[PDB]
Every structure is written in structure tokens, then in C-alpha cells.
Write a protein that binds this ligand. Structure first.
Ligand SMILES: Cc1cc2nc3c(=O)[nH]c(=O)nc-3n(C[C@H](O)[C@H](O)[C@H](O)COP(=O)(O)OP(=O)(O)OC[C@H]3O[C@@H](n4cnc5c(N)ncnc54)[C@H](O)[C@@H]3O)c2cc1C
Ligand code: NA
Ligand code: NA
Lengths: 634, 641
């Protein structure tokens, strides 16, 4: 290796070398400094993790096919280039739909109506990439991270009207409303081993009181969880975003890109990849892979496609690699507009038949290590909801909107601060106005609001139809009803372009799963295939995030090429005592939790007083009882 | 602003723009997610912090003068260029000595002998150092690889650890498996942690810790790998504990460390110099800066000139309305006296005129202008307290190397970890330690030569075999005392003919650890200063410790970011002390890996759960829980007491 020549004496005598664990597991690692340890801890994020890849061989004669060009696949290419030193020209995207980007869309225009189908700072893998990706609206040497922080540093995000009911009156959202039994259920969930929860659903575990709580109203709307989704995934979210728990009620835990995610993240990434010399196919349908299995392992040696109307097989040489974004969330989307309801063209009998789902189904046929696609896409009634993009000119809508806004909508600063959930709406309907303009070329008198509902089988309060039955102007009617401007519905409809989208696989990611149902990024025996997206398995990260897309991509690269590089686990902020205690206090609506009073007497006046959370707690009396309550809990 | 153009609407209605806290204090922050928050928490390290500076004006007309070409001065240059967009042309260094680099020296040759005044033990928590060096061209790897890359190429594939941390009785390995802290001495450590930083003014270490503590293997470990003397700052020791709480369990075998492939001049300094020279920064060697010209009026402090001693003459370098000045207000390697095999270092000062060397005069002069520039005399007024000596052994094959090979984790000539760090001769009168890092230690070091490093902590003690104080000894004599404790004193002649020795007496090596009080160290940019920044090991930061390279890079970034009022922050130290996993591990370690109070209770709760791995390494019934609870409540009770 002409890269490592001055180290060959050491590298050859190394036992670590080439046997790297590219995906360390923080949920199993007992962190100790021993003679064995030569690598950082499994979640030791920081600048020390900013070293680059060292390929052990040339990849000049190696081709790379990437099926699907969401962030997940473009991420794989970036790292193959950066860490594998694979020539960019050797990489080919075979795209399914032929607007790149996937679930991150910026479709539409002011005339026809825009159409769209939330992050925090712990998106660690995302920003490992985007800090070296050229900015949209800043000159060199500035990056996407730079402009992201240029606007988020100087305009805090928060809500002042998180919850409304009674035709527009602001509902109180200062408290979670969790009783003791439910606070215990959350805690026991955090303690439960991950492998013990196969196929269990949220409503299987949590009480009715929990499900009626503000906490769950907060969590279910902002994250898009349904009562029948995966218990495990919810648990993972809590571990993942524990530090954030005190800013859920007012969405102060969040930050947002200047524009829509397509224009902010997808375009600059694609543009960057297009500059180094990457190839893109916008007319190749991938239906299956040609995999050869034997005693040794699994090798992809061909890609079965449908170009035009014929079936063309792309050969995959022994030295080539393949990346697959195995599932789709936006597939089979059925749109609608103002005068038009979406005519849904499938039921649970035809669900799972589509370009994207079929490819995974064909993989599963080959070997059981490719997962169980049918568990995710076999119940549209459970994995669907409908979003509506509002293109708005001055209206009674915008009038009422300004009452809910933090800054003036047209100001370019934070507006609604995130979704505004209509508590007493039958659909469980939420809407949001992000920073305007949401689109770079948006007109100065146009606002783009976004709407969303969680119950697909309930008749609205005002419009006595289910949401998928409604026209654009009818959802406005249902919206206007809950905003007390029903009596001005005409002014709104004549000035608001509505484009709806019914997505049957939008929460298929969250469906109850069991062991082996999701493949690993690089399944047993696979020498040259990688699986990335919201449907492959990572150690502890969550899904329905761009972070998982990037996380899975990096794993693919490093594991396939056997690089020296790791992908650290999720940000260890849950282990931070400050966020543990903050969480405990917040779950309890600032009531004194157990041991707090004691903990206050000991730390107040010390170095660690700042560790104590916000609120007020006072202090063998009844210690004999908590002993025997805690003694019985275990 | 042509950078900001696309954001003017929002920025001109922002409450935060131009009011960033460039040095957030994690020691005071009640971390909460509130409407008021837009920045990350004070110590939220990671990639989100990898954004860049956005200067609000041009600096093409702005000259920047940097006194001191050490890792702190070069760092200020790097960040001025990186985040200030300051033309590298516009930057000039002014150095006192013959060569660039400062305390990270790496001179000498196989014929005269090498000389390293010292080595660099490190951790992965050096966030600012690595925020910089991750973008600095590698020495021994081609483009596009960084110093960070070649650093990890060697350290990822070769663990550092020791199998002979303590030796005594003329060669024998002392058992170094335990800390040996007792009930009371442990608790005294706990309390120090809990004490507010503001209450420890002028307190020394021996002022606070028992004699048992000071004889514990813990303190033997700590005092030798951190160069602490019993008469040093209590606050500093505490700061260290907070800083390196996560490393406490790998101190006894030094498994908590990583080392640069070479001396830090070749590994760190030279790559960075090369980088800055190429962009076009200027340097002036052998130039002594005696004093600054600061104009102080009703509205602030402004540097307006630099008074220099170039050669023998005195020259005054003017400083303009638009110019900036960065000062390294003290060097721990100031006024070194060198010796060798046949010569003891002939000490040209001793207490009577301790502190009247140059380099101190600049800080001394500055302190005369305003109390806000601190009190240098608290640091350079006692050579007997601030000094010790190191020796550099350039070794051909000899009975010394043969003995060394028994202490070595890997064969000395291999290129892997050798001693694993310092080996401390427990019962040496000088309290002498010695190390052998990965060899070669210099890029051009011969195949049959090894470089060994030796230092001692007691300067006023007659040796065990040579009945003199260390600074009285010739290089040959230091070899005698050393050979005695290794058991080779009967082959001293062989060792002497095959080992070149260069010693370095450093009168102010540990001057940074001297006890201090409120105001004794100036802030990086003192109150009123519009164009002066102060960097290095003698200036004030929120929580970081001194005698590290990390602090020098830390202070440099604070300098740039405050002086230019940038959008950029300097996060506090890595928050591993708040990691419940390192908390519990510390407690268990401080108790010789026997169960600490409370652990049993905790183990009843987390064992068999998602959080089992949190429990440290080393089960009674439900009936005894009411006991464990009361004995726990009783323990926290007596903590304050
Ligand atoms: C022997 C030794 C062992 C060490 N061990 C470790 C270790 O194991 N691990 C670790 O992390 N760190 C260690 N350190 C610390 C590390 O080397 C230093 O903290 C770091 O290099 C700080 O450098 P600096 O830029 O702050 O100042 P220095 O490098 O001390 O000074 C830089 C230069 O500024 C010059 N200067 C000062 N005043 C003036 C003036 N008025 N005019 C002109 N020039 C001036 C000086 O001549 C000096 O050469 C060690 C240091 C030494 C000396
Ligand atoms: Na709150
Ligand atoms: Na140990």
C-alpha cells in the first residue's frame, strides 16, 4: 500500500488491523480503559472521529451501482468516494422514480401549487458529510452546515400555540399530564432489553390514561406514531431523544433548515456528486438482483432491470458493489387537489406490489437474511396517512395564522415553530408554517403551509367524510372549522391552492417487527452488497430520520471495503446525568421525584448545582415505605 | 457583507447576532431546552460544531503580530486564517529563541545526542487540537491525509499500556494494581470534586490531603504522569480530576493514553509550521519582545506598539488602528540550562533572581499597566518549587537496553508501544521516572539507536547511589543512579560508553501549577482590550487544565473568536464527567474495584436490563436492601458534614 508504507512494520505486526468493528454497539459495551482498547468508546463522538478512510487496495477497476437516490444512496456514494477513494465516474445511480431525493421532495410551483410530502443537533453522521458539502446560498469555502447554523444560531425555534381546540382557542401545553403508573411504564420500557419486545405494539403496553395524555398527544403528532405501531421503535426514540424531552411541549428542542429538505440537503448533495463525475440513470427500473449463493457466501453478479419496456440485465463483475435502498415510504402515492379527491387504487390485496417493494420481496425469496418485507407493507390501513400542502395568498387563513405565529409569517424567522395540533379534531389534524420562503424561488406574497392528519377512517367535525374522501376545498373547510373561520371559507378557498397526497407506506417503517425482519446493512455472507434506508437494521438508531439514511450508508461503505473506519453509535446524551435528571423532573410535571430532595441537599452549593433541573424539592419516617415500594417494584 | 447577503432579512432582526458567548461555561449552565435557546449546550461537542467563521468585515488592511511561535501562537494564526479570513501575508511571528516550536522541542542528532525536554501523553478528548489538525497535511501520508489520519493509523493498531508502571528494590516490578486509598482519603477526593472552584484560592495540595493519600499508589501515579508536586495548586488538581474522570481507570497501566508517532516537533509543530509558511505567514527568530505599547483611556485598552530587542539593539514595531496582537504570556521552558555526560547544568540563577529572565519581563511589564493582566510573580518567584530536570538518553546496544527489554510490552526496536509510558522508580530519592516511547522517536533515528527519556521530581534530595542532588550530577552520574535502581550498576561502564546523555534543567517547568487566586491569570481577552489576546498556559479558561497542548489551542481559538466577535463558539471540555458510565466507573476504581456503597442497590435495579453495561467491573438478598439504603443515606449524609 503506497498510502501506508511508512507504517508497514507496525501495521503487519498489528492484531487490530483489518479486524475493525465498523459498527460498535453502545447498548452492550462496558466502557473501560484496558490494555485491549486502542479505539474510542463505541459512542465517543468528537473530532477524533474525523480521520478518513484508508483503502487497502485500488478501486479504479471497480464499479458501483446504487439502487435508489435518496439521501441514503447518495450518502453511500459520498463515502465510497471519500473513504474508499473510488473514482466518482465509476458510480452509477439507477433511480426508480426520476426526480432524485425520494421522501425529501420540493415539487410544485406557485401557479399549480407547491407540494411537500424535523431535526436536532445530534444528527451526527449527517453533519459528518454536510460540513464538507458546498453551501447553497453562501460562497466558498462555506458549507451546508454553515448556512444551516447561520440561520438557526440567530433564530431560535419554539411554539406559542402547540395545541389548539374549540375552533381555535389555544389549549394549555405546559404539562405532560402523566400519572404515576404511566411514568413507571415509561421507565420500565427504558429498562427493557431490546430483544424482548418482538411484535408488541404501543397500545399493547401503555395504559389508556397514557394514550390520552398531553405527552402522547405531543409525541404521536410530532413523530407520526400510531397507537398500533412498534413498541420497540418508540423505546428507541426515547433513548435517542431523551435529552430533548423538556422541549417537546413547545418544540424548543428542534431546529429547521432554511428551505424544504429537498432544496436544502438533496440538491447540494446531488450537485456535489454530479461535479466529481457521477453517473445517473433516469430511465432504469430495477426489479430484482442476480445473486449467486454457495458454500462461501453471497455475490451480486447482475442487476435485473426494466429499461424502456424490455428487460435488460446489467452485469455486476466480481470486483463491483451494489447498494439498495430496500424500502419506499412514498411509493404508490395518490395525489389530489382542490376540486379533486385522491382516487386510491389499491387495497391490502394489492399492497406490496410496486417497483420498490417488489425488489425487496424478491430479495427475501433468495435467503431469509434479507428480512421480511411483508410485515411492513401488508396493511395500508395501518401504515398510511395523508398530507396536504397549502399554497397561500393573503387570506382569512393567514389572518388567523398570525395569531399563532411567533414572528410574522413573512419575516423569514420562525413562525408556528412546528406543527400545531388540533386536539378535538376527529382526524387528529396538525398544520405548520415553517420559515418563509419554504422554497428558494417562492413569491413574496406567498406562504406555504403544510397539513397532516393521523386518522384515515374518521369523519370530520364539519365535513362528515374521512380525510381521504375529501377534496382540497373540503379539507380547508374542516380546517377552517377548527380555526373558527368557517364563516369565511369562500375567501380561503379562492386564495389557497391545496395539493393532497395519500401515502400508504408512510409509516410502514414503524410497523411491529421481530428478529430477522429487518436485514443488517451487510447481511451474513454478502461480499459485495449493501442495504441502506429506513428498513435495514442499525444497532440503536431510529428510523424516519435522515440520520439513519446516512448512518446506514456509512456502515455499508466501511463494512464492504473493510475500512479502518467506524460509525460510532448514537449520541450518548441519555447517559449524561444532566439529561437523566431533567427527564425525571419533566416526566413528573416538575413534581419532586424520588431522591430529588436528598439530591438537592447534597449538590446545592457545590460544583454540581447546575446539574439540578428546573423546579422545586423538599426532603426513618416514610423511608421505610419507599424502601418497601422500591423493594417490591423489583 | 457579501457572505451574509442572502440572510440579511433574518440577521438584521436577530436578537443574537453580534452577541454570541464565545466561551460558554459548562460549570454553570443549567442545560434546558427553552425558547431562548438557539445555540448548542456549552459542551455539546460533535460535528454540529464544525461550522466556520463568518467575519463581518474585511481584514486585508489588518496586520497581526504573534509573540511566541509555540502551538498556541501558531494556532491563533491558523484560526485567524480559517475563521477570520485574514490574509496569511498579514501575519508575523516574533520568536525569542533560535528555532520555531517552543516547549514541543525535538533537537539533537545521533552523534551529539538527541534532546527532548519532554514528551506528550494525550487523550482523545483533545477536541480543539484535533479540530485543527484534522485539516493539516500529514507528515508521512500523501494527500489528502491529515495529521489526524497518520496519528490514528499508528494508534488504532497499537495499544499503549504498561506492564511495569512501578519498579522498586533495584529493579523489581512493584504491584501496581490498586490505588490504595482508604475510607477517608477517598471521601476527601469526592469532596474536592464537589467544592466550588471559587473557594480554593491559594490552597496547596498538601494543605488538604492526608499523608496516607500522599503515599497512596494513586498519588504516586498522579504526581508522576502529571508532574504534580505536593506544594502545587489544589484547584489545578481538582480541575484535572474533572477533566480526566473518564481516564481514571486506565491510569495505573496507562491504557488511557495515546501517543504521537514521533517527538511533538516532528509530529505536530513542523506540519503546522509548513502549513502556515505555505499560505504565506512571516517569522522573525531570535527576536525578544520586552514590552507592549498599550493606550488606556476612558473607553478601553488599545495596543499601539511592540517594543522589541532584535539582537542587541531596541526596535519599536508600530501597531495600527486595525491591527491585532496575540501574546503567549509565559513559557514553562523559559531559561533552560543544558548539561551532558561530562557536564552538570551550571545554574545561572537561583531564587535570588528567580523570575528576572526575559519572557517573564513581558508579562511583568504588562501586569504593571493594569491589574487585569494578572500577577506573574505568583508563578515565577520560586525556582525551588517550579523546577525539575529531564535527561535524554541516546542509546546504542548496552546492558541498559537489555534490562529495558524486560519492562517492554513489545520489543523496543519494533515500532510498537515499549514501556507504555513512564516507569516510576518508587523508592528512588529523586523520585525518578523513565519512559521509552515507540521507536524511532525521530524520523531519521538510526536502526540501532533508541531514545530514552528520564525525569525526576525532587530537586533537593541526595540520590541513593550518587550522593548528590540531580542538578549537581553529570550525565554519566545520572546513568549511575539510574543503573543502580535497575540493578545494572555493575555494568555501568558498558552503559556509559553506549549512552549519550543530555540533561535539561527547567527552572519554570512546573510554574503553571503554582497556587493561584482570583485574578492571577488574565482572561484571553481582558476587560477593555479591543485588539489584544493572551494565549497559552498562563491565562484563564472556564474549566480546562494546563500543562497540555489542548489548552494552548483552546486559548488561541478564544482569542480569535472574541477579538473578531465571530459567530463561532468554543465549547467547554468534553462532558465525560457527566457520563453516568464514567461516574460509576470512577467510584468503583477509587475503591480498588471492591463494591462501593450504593453499588449493590444499583445492581439490584439495572442488572438484566438495557442499562446493565453501565455497571462497573469487579448477589445478596432482598432482605438486606433496607440495610443498604440506610447505609447509603448515611454516606451522602457525612459527605458535607
Ligand atoms: C517537558 C514537557 C513535558 C510535557 N508533557 C506533556 C504530556 O505528556 N502531555 C501533554 O498533553 N502535554 C505535555 N506538555 C505540555 C505542552 O508541551 C505544552 O503545554 C504546549 O506545548 C504549550 O505551548 P504554548 O504555545 O502554550 O507555550 P510554549 O510552547 O511553552 O511557548 C512557546 C514559545 O513562546 C516564546 N515566548 C514566550 N514569551 C515570549 C516573549 N516575550 N518574546 C518572544 N517569545 C516568547 C517562548 O520562547 C516559547 O518558545 C509538556 C511540556 C513540557 C515542556
Ligand atoms: Na418545556
Ligand atoms: Na486498570
Amino acid at each position: 500500500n503506497p498510502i501506508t508504507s511508512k507504517f508497514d512494520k507496525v501495521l503487519n505486526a498489528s492484531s487490530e488491523y483489518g479486524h475493525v468493528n465498523h459498527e460498535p454497539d453502545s447498548s452492550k459495551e462496558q466502557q473501560r480503559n484496558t490494555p485491549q482498547k486502542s479505539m474510542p468508546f463505541s459512542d465517543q463522538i468528537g473530532n477524533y472521529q474525523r480521520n478518513k478512510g484508508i483503502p487497502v487496495q485500488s478501486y479504479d477497476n471497480s464499479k458501483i451501482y446504487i439502487i435508489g437516490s435518496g439521501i441514503a444512496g447518495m450518502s453511500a456514494a459520498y463515502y465510497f468516494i471519500r473513504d474508499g477513494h473510488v473514482p466518482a465516474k465509476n458510480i452509477t445511480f439507477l433511480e426508480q422514480l426520476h426526480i432524485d431525493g425520494g421522501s425529501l421532495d420540493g415539487a410544485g410551483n406557485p401557479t399549480d401549487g407547491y407540494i411537500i410530502r424535523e431535526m436536532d443537533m445530534t444528527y451526527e453522521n449527517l453533519w459528518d458529510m454536510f460540513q464538507d458539502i458546498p453551501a447553497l446560498e453562501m460562497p466558498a469555502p462555506y458549507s451546508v452546515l454553515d448556512e444551516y447554523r447561520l440561520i438557526n444560531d440567530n433564530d431560535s425555534n419554539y411554539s406559542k400555540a402547540r395545541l389548539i381546540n374549540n375552533k381555535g382557542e389555544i389549549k394549555d401545553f405546559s404539562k405532560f399530564g402523566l400519572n404515576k403508573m404511566d411514568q413507571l411504564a415509561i421507565i420500565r420500557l427504558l429498562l427493557k432489553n431490546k430483544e424482548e419486545l418482538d411484535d408488541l405494539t404501543i397500545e399493547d403496553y401503555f395504559s389508556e390514561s397514557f394514550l390520552k395524555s398531553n405527552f402522547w398527544t405531543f409525541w404521536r403528532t410530532m413523530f407520526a406514531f400510531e397507537n398500533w405501531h412498534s413498541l420497540l421503535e418508540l423505546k428507541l426514540y426515547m433513548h435517542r431523544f431523551l435529552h430533548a424531552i423538556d422541549g417537546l411541549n413547545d418544540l424548543s428542542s428542534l431546529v429547521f433548515p432554511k428551505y424544504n429538505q429537498y432544496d436544502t440537503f438533496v440538491t447540494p448533495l446531488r450537485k456535489f456528486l454530479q461535479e466529481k463525475g457521477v453517473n445517473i440513470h433516469l430511465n432504469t427500473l430495477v426489479k430484482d438482483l442476480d445473486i449467486h449463493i454457495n458454500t462461501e457466501g453471497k455475490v451480486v453478479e447482475g442487476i435485473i432491470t426494466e429499461q424502456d419496456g424490455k428487460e435488460v440485465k446489467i452485469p455486476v463483475g466480481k470486483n463491483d458493489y451494489v447498494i439498495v435502498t430496500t424500502g419506499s415510504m412514498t411509493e404508490d402515492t395518490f395525489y389530489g387537489n382542490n376540486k379533486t379527491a385522491p382516487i386510491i387504487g389499491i387495497d391490502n390485496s394489492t399492497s406490496g406490489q410496486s417497483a420498490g417493494w417488489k425488489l425487496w420481496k424478491n430479495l427475501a425469496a433468495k435467503s431469509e437474511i434479507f428480512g421480511k418485507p411483508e410485515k411492513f407493507c401488508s396493511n395500508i390501513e395501518k401504515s398510511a396517512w395523508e398530507s396536504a400542502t397549502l399554497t397561500c395568498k393573503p387570506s382569512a387563513l393567514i389572518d388567523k395564522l398570525k395569531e399563532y405565529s411567533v414572528n410574522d409569517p413573512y419575516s423569514g424567522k420562525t413562525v408556528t415553530g412546528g406543527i400545531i395540533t388540533i386536539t378535538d379534531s376527529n382526524w387528529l389534524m396538525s398544520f405548520t408554517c415553517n420559515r418563509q420562503p419554504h422554497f428558494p424561488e417562492q413569491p413574496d406574497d406567498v406562504l406555504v403551509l403544510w397539513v397532516y392528519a393521523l386518522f384515515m377512517d374518521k369523519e370530520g367535525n364539519y365535513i362528515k367524510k374521512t380525510m381521504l374522501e375529501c377534496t382540497g376545498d373540503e379539507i380547508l373547510a374542516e380546517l377552517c372549522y377548527h380555526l373558527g373561520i368557517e364563516d369565511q371559507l369562500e375567501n380561503v378557498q379562492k386564495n389557497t391552492i391545496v395539493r393532497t397526497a395519500f401515502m400508504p407506506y408512510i409509516t410502514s417503517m414503524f410497523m411491529p417487527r421481530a428478529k430477522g425482519d429487518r436485514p443488517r446493512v451487510v447481511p451474513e455472507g454478502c461480499k459485495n452488497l449493501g442495504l441502506v434506508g429506513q428498513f435495514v437494521e442499525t444497532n440503536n438508531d431510529v428510523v424516519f430520520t435522515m440520520e439513519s439514511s446516512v448512518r446506514t450508508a456509512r456502515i455499508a461503505v466501511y463494512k464492504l471495503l473493510n475500512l479502518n473506519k467506524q460509525v460510532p453509535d448514537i449520541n450518548p446524551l441519555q447517559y449524561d446525568i444532566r439529561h437523566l435528571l431533567k427527564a425525571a423532573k419533566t416526566l413528573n410535571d416538575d413534581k419532586p421525584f424520588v431522591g430529588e430532595g436528598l439530591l438537592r441537599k447534597v449538590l446545592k452549593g457545590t460544583y454540581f448545582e447546575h446539574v439540578l433541573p428546573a423546579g422545586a424539592a423538599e426532603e426513618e419516617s416514610f423511608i421505610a415505605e419507599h424502601v418497601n415500594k422500591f423493594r417490591e417494584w423489583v
